[PDB]
Paper text:
The TRAPP complexes are nucleotide exchange factors that play essential roles in membrane traffic and autophagy. TRAPPII activates Rab11, and [name] activates [name], with the two complexes sharing a core of small subunits that affect nucleotide exchange but being distinguished by specific large subunits that are essential for activity in vivo. We report a cryo‐EM structure of the entire Drosophila [name] complex. The [name]‐specific subunits [name] and [name] hold the catalytic core like a pair of tongs, with TRAPPC12 and TRAPPC13 positioned at the joint between them.
Expressing [name] without the TRAPPC12 and TRAPPC13 subunits reduces its size by ~100 kDa, close to the combined weight of two subunits, indicating that their absence does not affect the binding of the other nine subunits. This “[name]” complex is still able to activate [name] but, like the complete complex, it has no detectable activity on Rab11. Moreover, in the case of the [name], similar narrow rod and triangular particles were found in the cryo‐EM micrographs, but threefold symmetrical particles rarely appeared among the 2D class averages. We reanalysed cryo‐EM images of [name] following a similar strategy to that used for [name]. The comparison between the [name] and [name] class 2D averages and 3D models revealed that the flat rod was similar, but in [name] there was density missing at the region of interaction between the two arms. We concluded TRAPPC12 and TRAPPC13 were located in this region of [name], forming one of the vertexes of the triangle.
Numbering used by the authors:
A (entry chain C): 1 to 145
B (entry chain B): 2 to 152
C (entry chain D): 1 to 219
D (entry chain A): 10 to 174
The structure:
């Protein structure tokens, strides 16, 4: 029962890649507009907290939850965004996304000469390595702090 | 993690190729580089006495130079009788980052020049000569096809 | 356990009630010398800083009072403007008050307004099928817990981030809701609920939960 | 053996500078190529620097100085020492006793206007704009041009902000 999906968005708000494993609710929206909608929503939540914060939001937003699934968010200071869907309840995954960034992305993307900056990744090695790093802990559930 | 500089820099060289020449890359990189590595090679297996001339297969010296730079070993080493021969390597670092699917093949001559341009020795197969072509069939698998400067 | 604020919104999503539990914003003063490393930037009624958040003056710390004299939106109380005051040197060395903009009520209305869709559009195109929306949104230094009435009204409160056992507290605020809508069912969602009786009953629920007991369901 | 794994880089850089310099006669043209190529390189490098140092993000120039000198520590194995702050904290200076990326590239090439550290300037700026910090970069002192210490200068010009959701 592995993760549903995983999203990437640049500091300009463009969808880099979407990998799906177990998402089932078949989308009425073509994925690109959906990614745009999600990036805008996340931006909205950033503004939302940055206004209604009692004090400094050092890392600001963390994630949101539903009763029957959950989702988590990762912020990269360069402005790239990380989003994946998980189940509601298992270990946290903020760290797991940090790791995926610092290893899989920084290795199999930027250190790829044939990925031009700010486009869609289409590397079969980045694809397969994402597949395997997810298959590392195909764990579903978050209960994130 | 000092490699990242060189991976990015060689990547951007793979990027720009102005139409005047294919490989504007002169070999002074290779010359001064092997001289540096040989500053670190202040010892190599050749006898103290000058007359008894022993040649070091530049195949082996290429192995060692990779360990000094490319860090991963040359694997399949087929050699004809004379100075013509080849290396068959399953993995190549700059092509480790590209998809293994044999779809991006052109990026080799920047690779193969770097193993050319190493000054010769009078005794053949002594370990330093270089003039090399590449035929990368599979992406990680470079195929540096050697031709000595001599016959 | 300290609750920063309490809220409820309607089928419209309009902010029907926005009691705040007295959580002040940080303040700073320091005897400012020649032009300040605080990077002051004018942005549309905000006289703020964009960089060099030093000494506990956050970026979002809007200029609040100047040299004791209050400062209002862009200019000051006395008629001086922040720019003219600042860039004149010989006034220095001087004190400047700074703090964060307690979003005036109307701004809070706007905030609740813009948040409602996120509730109703919490990826309704979810992975999981026939899903359900948002309920829990953790954040940096607050955490949002909402209780859908399971049909209709939304119940969102703002609590200390590191805490559990609050959804039952939401159920009890739901009980207070029922208590009050007994008052006048004509007094419906359309008008907002500002009836000081039920409201001090809520502030007593607050009083109980400020003390230890959130077990001891007593409200 | 292997005091410096990447002394290779400086010779590659010397190859690139002389190749351009033969191609483009002007020190100015190669200055722009060095700057932009540093730009792309620093764009490549800043993300890895934030994968390792895992910095929150830079909201203050003292933080920016510490971060970038740390990157120099971890990328070029050098220890620049922050100094000469602006009264407004915009400028600060990075003290390179040995520009690591040069080992007697050439003291006289008979060519002023040919600045070497422009690659660093490009890297620092491209990195910074990845993290939403438009700061200009130049070089107040430079050993090669006759100085004793090579000193990069950056002054906080503008705070870029993400817009258009």
């Amino acid at each position: 029962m592995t993760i549903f999906n995983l999203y990437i968005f640049d500091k300009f708000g463009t969808l880099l890649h979407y990998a799906e494993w177990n998402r089932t609710k078949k989308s009425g929206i073509t994925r690109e507009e959906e990614a745009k909608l999600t990036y805008g929503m996340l931006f909205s939540i950033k503004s939302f907290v940055s206004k209604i914060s009692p004090h400094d939001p050092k890392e600001g937003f963390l994630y949101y939850k539903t009763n029957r699934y959950a989702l988590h968010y990762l912020e990269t200071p360069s402005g790239l965004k990380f989003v994946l869907n998980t189940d509601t309840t298992a270990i946290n995954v903020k760290e797991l996304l940090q790791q995926l960034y610092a290893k899989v992305w920084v290795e199999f993307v930027v250190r790829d000469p044939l990925w031009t900056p700010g486009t869609v990744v289409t590397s079969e090695l980045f694809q397969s390595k994402l597949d395997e790093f997810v298959r590392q802990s195909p764990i579903f559930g978050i209960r994130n702090i | 993690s000092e490699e990242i500089l060189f991976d990015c820099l060689h990547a951007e060289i793979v990027n720009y190729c102005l139409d005047s020449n294919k490989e504007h890359d002169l070999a002074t990189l290779e010359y001064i580089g092997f001289t540096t590595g040989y500053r670190l090679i202040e010892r190599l297996t050749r006898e103290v006495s000058r007359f008894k001339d022993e040649l070091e297969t530049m195949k082996f010296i290429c192995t060692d130079f990779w360990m000094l730079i490319y860090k991963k070993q040359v694997d399949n080493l087929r050699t004809n009788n004379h100075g013509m021969y080849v290396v068959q390597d399953k993995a190549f670092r700059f092509l480790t980052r590209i998809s293994p699917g044999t779809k991006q093949l052109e990026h080799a001559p920047k690779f193969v020049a770097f193993t050319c341009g190493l000054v010769r020795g009078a005794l053949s197969n002594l370990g330093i000569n270089s003039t090399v072509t590449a035929e990368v069939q599979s992406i990680p698998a470079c195929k540096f096809h050697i031709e000595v400067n001599r016959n | 356990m300290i609750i920063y604020g309490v809220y409820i919104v309607s089928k419209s999503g309009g902010l029907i009630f926005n009691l705040d539990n007295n959580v002040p914003r940080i303040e700073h003063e320091k005897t400012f010398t020649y032009p300040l490393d605080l990077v002051l930037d004018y942005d549309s009624k905000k006289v703020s800083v964009s960089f060099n958040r030093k000494d506990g003056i956050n970026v979002g710390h809007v200029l609040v009072a100047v040299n004791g004299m209050p400062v209002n939106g862009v200019t000051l109380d006395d008629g001086r403007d922040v720019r003219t005051t600042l860039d004149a040197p010989e006034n220095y060395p001087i004190n400047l008050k700074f703090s964060r903009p307690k979003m005036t009520t109307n701004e809070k209305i706007f905030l609740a307004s813009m948040f409602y869709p996120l509730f109703a559009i919490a990826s309704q195109l979810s992975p999981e099928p026939k899903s359900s929306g948002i309920e829990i949104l953790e954040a940096d230094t607050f955490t949002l817990h909402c209780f859908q009435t399971l049909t209709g009204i939304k119940f969102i409160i703002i609590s200390e981030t590191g805490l559990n056992g609050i959804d039952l507290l939401l159920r009890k605020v739901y009980e207070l809701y029922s208590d009050y809508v007994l008052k006048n069912p004509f007094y419906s969602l359309e008008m907002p609920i500002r009836c000081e009786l039920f409201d001090n009953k809520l502030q007593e629920l607050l009083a109980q939960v400020e003390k230890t007991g959130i077990s001891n369901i007593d409200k | 053996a292997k005091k410096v794994n990447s002394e290779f880089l400086t010779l590659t850089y010397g190859a690139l500078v002389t190749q351009m310099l033969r191609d483009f006669e002007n020190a100015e043209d190669v200055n722009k190529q060095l700057e932009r190529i540093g730009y792309n390189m620093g764009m490549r490098l800043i993300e890895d620097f934030l994968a390792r140092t895992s910095a929150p993000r830079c909201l203050e120039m003292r933080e920016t100085a510490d971060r970038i000198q740390q990157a120099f520590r971890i990328y070029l194995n050098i220890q620049p020492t922050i100094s000469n702050w602006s009264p407004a904290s915009d400028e600060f200076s990075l003290v390179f006793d040995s520009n690591p990326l040069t080992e007697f590239v050439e003291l006289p090439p008979d060519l002023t206007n040919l600045r070497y550290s422009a690659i660093l300037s490009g890297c620092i700026r491209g990195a910074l704009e990845m993290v939403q910090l438009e700061v200009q970069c130049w070089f107040v002192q430079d050993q090669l041009k006759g100085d004793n210490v090579t000193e990069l200068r950056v002054k906080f010009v503008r705070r870029l902000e993400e817009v258009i959701p």
